[PDB]
Amino acid sequence: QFTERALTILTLAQKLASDHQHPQLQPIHILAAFIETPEDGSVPYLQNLIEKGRYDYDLFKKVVNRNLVRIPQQQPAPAEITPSYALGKVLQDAAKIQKQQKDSFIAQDHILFALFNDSSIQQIFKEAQVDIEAIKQQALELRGYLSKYAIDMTEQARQGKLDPVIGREEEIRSTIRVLARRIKSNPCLIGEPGIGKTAIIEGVAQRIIDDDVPTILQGAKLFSLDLAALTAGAKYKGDFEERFKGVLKEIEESKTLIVLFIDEIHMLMGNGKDDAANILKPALSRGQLKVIGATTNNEYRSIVEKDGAFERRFQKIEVAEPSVRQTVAILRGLQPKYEIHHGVRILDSALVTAAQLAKRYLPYRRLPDSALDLVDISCAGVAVARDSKPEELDSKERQLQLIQVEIKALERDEDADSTTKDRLKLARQKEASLQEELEPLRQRYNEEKHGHEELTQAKKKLDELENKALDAERRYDTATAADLRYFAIPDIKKQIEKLEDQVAEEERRAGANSMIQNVVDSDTISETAARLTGIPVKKLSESENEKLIHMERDLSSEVVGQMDAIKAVSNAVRLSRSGLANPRQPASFLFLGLSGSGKTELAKKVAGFLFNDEDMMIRVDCSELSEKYAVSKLLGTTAGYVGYDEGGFLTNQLQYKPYSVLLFDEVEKAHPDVLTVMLQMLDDGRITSGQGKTIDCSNCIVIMTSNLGAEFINSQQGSKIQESTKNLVMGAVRQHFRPEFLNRISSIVIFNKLSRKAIHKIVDIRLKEIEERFEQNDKHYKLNLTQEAKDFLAKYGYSDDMGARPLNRLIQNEILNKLALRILKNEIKDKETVNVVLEECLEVLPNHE
Amino acid sequence: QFTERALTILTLAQKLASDHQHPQLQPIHILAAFIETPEDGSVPYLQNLIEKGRYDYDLFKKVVNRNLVRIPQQQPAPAEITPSYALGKVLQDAAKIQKQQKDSFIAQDHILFALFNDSSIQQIFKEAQVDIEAIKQQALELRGYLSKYAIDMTEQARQGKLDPVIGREEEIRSTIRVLARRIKSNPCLIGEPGIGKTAIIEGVAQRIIDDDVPTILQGAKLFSLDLAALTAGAKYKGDFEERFKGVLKEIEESKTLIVLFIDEIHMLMGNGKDDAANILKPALSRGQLKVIGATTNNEYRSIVEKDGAFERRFQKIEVAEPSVRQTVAILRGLQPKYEIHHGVRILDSALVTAAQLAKRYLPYRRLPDSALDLVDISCAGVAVARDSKPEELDSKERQLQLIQVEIKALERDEDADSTTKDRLKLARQKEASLQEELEPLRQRYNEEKHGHEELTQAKKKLDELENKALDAERRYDTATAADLRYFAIPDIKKQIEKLEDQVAEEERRAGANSMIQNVVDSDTISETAARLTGIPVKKLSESENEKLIHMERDLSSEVVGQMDAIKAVSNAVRLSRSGLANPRQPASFLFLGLSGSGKTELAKKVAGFLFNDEDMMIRVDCSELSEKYAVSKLLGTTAGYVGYDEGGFLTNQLQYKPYSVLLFDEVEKAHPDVLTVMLQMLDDGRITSGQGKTIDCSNCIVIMTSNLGAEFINSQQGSKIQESTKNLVMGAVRQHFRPEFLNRISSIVIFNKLSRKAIHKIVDIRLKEIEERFEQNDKHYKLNLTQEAKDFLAKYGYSDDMGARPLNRLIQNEILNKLALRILKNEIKDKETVNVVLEECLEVLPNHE
Numbered sequence A, B: 001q002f003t004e005r006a007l008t009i010l011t012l013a014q015k016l017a018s019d020h021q022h023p024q025l026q027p028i029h030i031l032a033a034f035i036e037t038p039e040d041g042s043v044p045y046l047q048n049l050i051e052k053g054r055y056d057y058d059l060f061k062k063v064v065n066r067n068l069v070r071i072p073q074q075q076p077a078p079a080e081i082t083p084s085y086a087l088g089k090v091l092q093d094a095a096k097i098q099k100q101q102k103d104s105f106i107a108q109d110h111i112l113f114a115l116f117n118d119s120s121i122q123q124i125f126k127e128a129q130v131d132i133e134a135i136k137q138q139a140l141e142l143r144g145y146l147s148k149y150a151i152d153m154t155e156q157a158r159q160g161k162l163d164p165v166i167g168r169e170e171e172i173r174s175t176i177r178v179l180a181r182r183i184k185s186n187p188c189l190i191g192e193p194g195i196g197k198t199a200i201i202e203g204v205a206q207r208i209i210d211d212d213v214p215t216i217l218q219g220a221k222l223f224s225l226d227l228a229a230l231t232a233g234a235k236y237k238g239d240f241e242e243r244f245k246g247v248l249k250e251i252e253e254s255k256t257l258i259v260l261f262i263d264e265i266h267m268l269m270g271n272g273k274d275d276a277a278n279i280l281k282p283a284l285s286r287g288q289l290k291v292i293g294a295t296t297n298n299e300y301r302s303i304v305e306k307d308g309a310f311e312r313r314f315q316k317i318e319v320a321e322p323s324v325r326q327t328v329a330i331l332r333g334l335q336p337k338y339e340i341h342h343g344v345r346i347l348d349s350a351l352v353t354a355a356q357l358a359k360r361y362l363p364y365r366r367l368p369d370s371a372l373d374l375v376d377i378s379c380a381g382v383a384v385a386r387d388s389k390p391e392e393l394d395s396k397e398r399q400l401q402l403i404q405v406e407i408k409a410l411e412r413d414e415d416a417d418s419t420t421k422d423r424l425k426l427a428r429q430k431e432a433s434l435q436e437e438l439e440p441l442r443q444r445y446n447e448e449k450h451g452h453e454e455l456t457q458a459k460k461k462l463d464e465l466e467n468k469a470l471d472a473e474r475r476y477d478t479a480t481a482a483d484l485r486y487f488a489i490p491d492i493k494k495q496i497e498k499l500e501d502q503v504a505e506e507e508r509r510a511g512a513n514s515m516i517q518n519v520v521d522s523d524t525i526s527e528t529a530a531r532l533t534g535i536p537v538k539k540l541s542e543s544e545n546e547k548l549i550h551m552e553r554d555l556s557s558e559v560v561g562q563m564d565a566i567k568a569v570s571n572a573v574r575l576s577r578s579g580l581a582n583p584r585q586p587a588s589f590l591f592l593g594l595s596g597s598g599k600t601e602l603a604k605k606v607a608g609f610l611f612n613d614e615d616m617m618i619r620v621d622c623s624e625l626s627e628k629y630a631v632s633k634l635l636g637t638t639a640g641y642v643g644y645d646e647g648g649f650l651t652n653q654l655q656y657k658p659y660s661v662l663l664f665d666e667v668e669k670a671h672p673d674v675l676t677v678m679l680q681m682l683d684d685g686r687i688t689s690g691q692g693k694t695i696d697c698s699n700c701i702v703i704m705t706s707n708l709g710a711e712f713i714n715s716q717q718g719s720k721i722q723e724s725t726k727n728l729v730m731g732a733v734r735q736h737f738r739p740e741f742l743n744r745i746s747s748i749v750i751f752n753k754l755s756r757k758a759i760h761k762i763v764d765i766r767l768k769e770i771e772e773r774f775e776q777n778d779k780h781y782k783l784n785l786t787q788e789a790k791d792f793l794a795k796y797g798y799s800d801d802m803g804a805r806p807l808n809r810l811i812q813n814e815i816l817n818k819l820a821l822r823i824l825k826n827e828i829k830d831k832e833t834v835n836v837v838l839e840e841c842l843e844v845l846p847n848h849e
């Protein structure tokens, strides 16, 4: 079919044959059809591909008019009996040209290409155009180089390959509102990268296409001017200015109220620069050039700090992150796209779960991207598995080849006639069994694959019908809108439903099919999340009974005594993983006590327990504090400063390990310099670093620790600290920290004197671990602590003022020192005996062998 | 060889000879190369040497273009052939001109001088150009960097299309006066960005074209510079400095005198001097280089302190934000511009509102900037509102189209004849019904559109006639000015008035145009501000007293009891809001009652209402307080002493939240020296600090709290405290506090003891908040509190001394921690059962499922 421009030329050619009473419509008339006027700025006459291509128009009009005179007349009714072979071919070739250029309709431009292929003027010395070489270049020389350096967003949005962007309607309308401004008329989208800023623009393109804009903008058009525009479409010094003040100049006039945009967005800080004004200001001032800009939060600040003129030319727009609900709605709209992408079924609950998980395990990553990546990655994953089902197929194929080896090893011989090798027949029988089992597995699997291919295509076809329906609706093309809405779409819809039923669900499983090829809400998605990030905080691992429910016992086992603290912890972690801890606040505690009490041991054991890794913990030296409080703290240094470790000791670790237990050392030594930062983590954990990037602390439990309370706790008035003493501690804590800081801590916890009844068990744990960690048991002890070593250790070391620490020392002082001596003296070959003789008395083994 | 302009103009001559297929390239083609188009603005054609040299350029245009046509046409092989002697000589002579001018390349003007010497127009009335010495005088007017780095503000002003500058008349004159100086004549505008500092520059541009400028300056041009030659980008050392030198010296040649303007001195400074940026400016502080600089008050001081020279190169010209009334005057001057800029009408009260509101909500942004945007945005909003036309028409037309689709869909069938689908005729009735509604709606909208349209067009015509009159008047063209005043302008005014008759405000529609809602006072403006900043109570078109009163009623309802306290506060606040209280004094209160009484919450609610945010509350622990009162308060330590974070806790919040509430928690425990500071704090809001800067507390309510008389309140003498009880808490206040304090406090506010009869409401409110705040779910309780929880929570929880603090803790432990555990046990699918067992617990709703 033809465009309005092309159809006009066709129509005019026919008109001219009738007007001149000619029996045949010839290229001469179509050439005449182009030269409607003698206008210098008209593409049909002097901005024409022919003029710029090869033959001059003063000469052209002479050629055309000479032929119009030479072509014979009729008595009007017989005009145009034929179009000649020539226009038949040219007009159809113009369709061929569409196909070469991948255009939807025949352009007048295409008719000119068709004419170049067939342009020949009868004469002894015939006139002609170059077959096509010049015109391909001349097409670029029409306003169209815009398409060389830019994507016509409205053309593409109208054509297809554009997602149903939703949840951005507020922002789309706001962007349009800015375009409706008179001074700051160039909206700018600001936020996280990857947030749908382009999607907003695309949404605007759709509204322009639909004419759902405030009248003035109905005459508008959107283009993405980039990449090629920036650099790739050129190679010489000065080419920038030439393509810039070329494509922009073309854009600036006549061809609709063109609005441009950048996809590399921050790029204006390099694509503007010397031309920061020239890129727009005078193009807007002289007419209608408008743009939709964009930048990240950090880049926004940079373009402002660098220039700032952009705040006179542009209007800053914040772009939101969607809620899980909104994210899911987005995923649902695109769910069939994803199913088509991989030929995989996707559960609705997988979109919900992926969105919930993405926020829970990667809170600092864009939610809709992360949710999607989790899905597209897992979709891709199962699609890969389904290529071979190797567990059955590779296993049998290997067994078959192993048989082939046995076959040649036994067959290609003289001993082949002896039972020595003729035993081979047994392997051949096995070969046959494997071939017979394998082929139906193979074909069954191919059938399962085909079912997915059928679904893929059925869904694809439906969407194409929809794309077409949407264009028909905006054209108010009732006829094709009806062709699609009635019967065609319902047909494919029903085919899809039938194809889904072809899965042949049976009571034994969701399909007669042996393979899954689906995205299961938790199994597929939770697994993928774990494979991608290690720790799946919302996995809800089966063993909850120990993992949080009986955490008190696990903590009691690792941390003996301090039952009050353990119970305080147990309540805390249950709130953090049950989801009850309100999302507005990471759980946080202050651990107060005496040295050797185990207060940091408990926190480490919490990390141990929750992540199965005590090294999951991130430590903060809150006592090493001065005005430098940057790279070593939760803020980092700031972009523009020398060095790239912008929180290189913490902020990067917090994102690296998205959640953990963050623990601060002796916070009593801390100052507001960082306490007012820790505060930003204590609740509403969104600390923005000097990178412009945010920690977004959520799941992470934050522990503050201190011996501040020792001032009263060390009264030792019972191992269990009593009210009074605790209030004095509380008082002192409030003296040290802003009480409001403290009020954002979930609870302040006071540790007890580590009781001797606890220590009496702790030392066994320690001694066991001490020995086990000493490389290999090529030495070590038999470790018969008996009643006596345990009691010596107690009587000579369970100090009320050092807890477990003096025991570490005692053990070394006695137990390991004597061992070392027995080792050095070659009294031990392996292991060693343990006892006390009155006075620790490590015994000695028979001399080393 | 040739330079870019020269090689191009030669290339064009050569191109024309080959394009028109001429046998020879000659003076006609080079003249044609210069006369590219009829545009006089083409540098090659009329503002060129061609018009300025005398020759009747119309003759060159006609003769040359006619000759391109008359010169014989040839085949491509004979096309062009040679430049001949004729142009050989011209180009060779152009080289001789290079020698004359010291030009490294041949210039287009050299070509013209040479061309002019040899070529003439052979006509019966033959002409030739004035000799080249006269022509060179004209050549020297063109160029000899600003075109790539600056905007010619005076020429812009001369052409109109420049906003009138309002409220800066003296600042404009001040810079002119300074520019008149023989040395160090560069003024620098000092003030915050967005204050209209460039408005002054625009104003100067207007003074130049108005001829109000001293002759010595009058003959000068005015440019807006910086950034393009400072911050835009560099690859090497000196890239900006090269551009500086370029401009710094180009300015000394040909172009009389040029006044430049620098957007920001802070970007210049000198990078540790380092022979960079700013250091190049003092170099020409006597060397003409007239320039108006600009920076901020804050940076200015540090620029000068670090530089030492700047203050002797540039003059310190201060610029400040306009008052709200001045802002409105600016807006009024722009009001009709906004109307034509947007195609809307604007109420004057909207300008008033915009200026008032814009100031009130922007502690971090300039009034004239934001007032101008508030108006440009809000009126853009109204312009966007024209969407009403397609909104109403499309909602209906869309349904119409859906109906039409059904119609074509069902007509093309066999069931179409069956009533099965022939009931379709009803769809046709609906199509028609909608068409009948759509046509008068559409025509209504067309009329509405045209009404405003024509009004706008007439206003635009008026403004351009006015621009012509203003130019005619200032340039003393009394003929033009008189004609414009001689009814041209009065008549367009009459047309505008007749168009107002066509607006035809109807009694039912106060402007016959629903598309143009108009910028309606504060409805449009508050809406706009709210859309841009958040939605406060402040959005309402209410007096300060009414906003307060409506909120006081909510306050009385939300707080349990304490109505007497609320009224005491309300009275004082109203006195203050009215301006009757002396403005120097912030309101302040002493909240006297029981600990746990809600006194803090009253104050928070006051913040929640008067400042629309409970979380803006600033708090002081007065019990943890001794003789050293510093950082934790307002004073900070004295700078010169460690404790640079002056008034780290309170001053910082007050200075960043000037409109808030500050509490003194248990103020009766404050150290006596602090209490004397308090006297300072209770009036004369210019409260001191360590840096010497005062607080200027006005809009911050300061509430001191006290439990001094708590024991009398405990007497339970009425649910609202009665005489002989409240008199004793005041007695205690008189005993403790000096009369001096009591004589400054707006009111001593007395709180009552209140039983569970209404405290239970608090308990319920908190329970509602607690379940509702769970952002990710709604597993709502079967909240079977029954009487047992009402009292348990009010018996083992809510305390006469600690209020709700223990409720919160009971709920966390007996409800949320119990809930967390059973969630992790997977015993909850949805909802949960309350089961108070006498203490408290939850029953598991599923059967431990």
Ligand SMILES: Nc1ncnc2c1ncn2[C@@H]1O[C@H](COP(=O)(O)OP(=O)(O)OP(O)(O)=S)[C@@H](O)[C@H]1O
Binding pocket: A163, A164, A165, A166, A167, A168, A192, A193, A194, A195, A196, A197, A198, A199, A200, A263, A264, A265, A330, A368, A369
């Ligand atoms: N509201 C939405 N509805 C549908 N798809 C969306 C939506 N928001 C984002 N997406 C998709 O999420 C991705 C992020 O979109 P983009 O607009 O490219 O991000 P961006 O903000 O443009 O960042 P850059 O700098 O252009 S990568 C895209 O692949 C979009 O298709």
Ligand SMILES: Nc1ncnc2c1ncn2[C@@H]1O[C@H](COP(=O)(O)OP(=O)(O)OP(O)(O)=S)[C@@H](O)[C@H]1O
Binding pocket: A558, A559, A560, A561, A562, A594, A595, A596, A597, A598, A599, A600, A601, A602, A754, A758, A762, A766, A803, A804, A805
């Ligand atoms: N209740 C306990 N159960 C098991 N081990 C314990 C216990 N208490 C202390 N320890 C041991 O004591 C050490 C940690 O003691 P803590 O008191 O947490 O550390 P600390 O004394 O605070 O050291 P700081 O605070 O960084 S100086 C570990 O090596 C533990 O094995």
Ligand SMILES: Nc1ncnc2c1ncn2[C@@H]1O[C@H](COP(=O)(O)OP(=O)(O)OP(O)(O)=S)[C@@H](O)[C@H]1O
Binding pocket: A308, A309, A310, A311, A312, B163, B164, B165, B166, B167, B168, B192, B193, B194, B195, B196, B197, B198, B199, B263, B330, B368, B369, B372
């Ligand atoms: N008195 C006035 N008369 C006319 N226009 C004004 C007036 N005051 C302010 N403006 C306009 O309001 C804005 C404030 O101007 P400036 O203070 O120069 O902004 P700025 O400091 O230049 O900010 P940048 O750097 O250009 S984003 C300008 O865009 C002026 O056009």
Ligand SMILES: Nc1ncnc2c1ncn2[C@@H]1O[C@H](COP(=O)(O)OP(=O)(O)OP(O)(O)=S)[C@@H](O)[C@H]1O
Binding pocket: B558, B559, B560, B561, B562, B594, B595, B596, B597, B598, B599, B600, B601, B754, B762, B801, B802, B803, B804, B805
């Ligand atoms: N009459 C009341 N109106 C509203 N809330 C009240 C009332 N009485 C008690 N409360 C609640 O109980 C608490 C009392 O708070 P406050 O009086 O600030 O306690 P406080 O005296 O500040 O000392 P703490 O340590 O914060 S309890 C608040 O959280 C209130 O919600």
